[PDB]
Amino acid sequence: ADLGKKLLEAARAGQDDEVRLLLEHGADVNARDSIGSTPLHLAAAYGHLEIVRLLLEHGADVNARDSTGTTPLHYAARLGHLEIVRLLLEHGADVNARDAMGWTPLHLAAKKGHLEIVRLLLKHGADVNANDHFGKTAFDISIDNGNEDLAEILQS
């Protein structure tokens, strides 16, 4: 296989030394799979913090979008990986990126009940008044979902 297909595979699987190698030997850091996912997307999704650091150090596009408009920060926020959320934000991730449904990382964290993530996104400039395409804010999702603590952080 092409260096980029391997990198995607390695990233998803958490193979740190294999990702480290591929990058040192010129694999496309932003290689795309069938749905537009990059290595970064996959590492952020599957919780591979070390691979996220490696990728970012080798110039990964921190704000890459897949076919659904989903960024690595959306995945890290949705799936609860607070230390990856922190790292991505420190590397210039777009805190208010909207996916195809209009959801920001904040909306995704609110949907999934991730409080410490909500608190960290709000700390780095998340737009608490952002409406998704359904016309709802992160708060409204909290109410519908039924999350008292999160409903509460969102309205301080």
Residues that bind Mg ion (CB under 5 A): 71-73, 93-94, 97, 104-106, 121, 126-127, 130
Residue closer to Mg ion by CB (options 21, 143) is: 143
Q: Shortest Cβ distance from residue 92 to Mg ion (Å)?
A: 8
Residue closer to Mg ion by CB (options 16, 127) is: 127
Q: Shortest Cβ distance from residue 24 to Mg ion (Å)?
A: 24
Amino acid type, 91: H
Q: Shortest Cβ distance from residue 75 to Mg ion (Å)?
A: 8
Of 67, 50, 117, 61, residue with least CA distance to 94: 61
DSSP 47-101: T-HHHHHHHHHTT--TT---TT---HHHHHHHTT-HHHHHHHHHTT--TT---TT
Residue 28, classed as helix, strand or coil, is coil
Q: At 118, which helix (H) or strand (E)?
A: helix 115-123
Q: Shortest Cβ distance from residue 1 to Mg ion (Å)?
A: 26
Residue closer to Mg ion by CB (options 56, 121) is: 121
* 19 close to 51: Cβ distance less than 8 angstroms: yes
Residue closer to Mg ion by CB (options 13, 130) is: 130
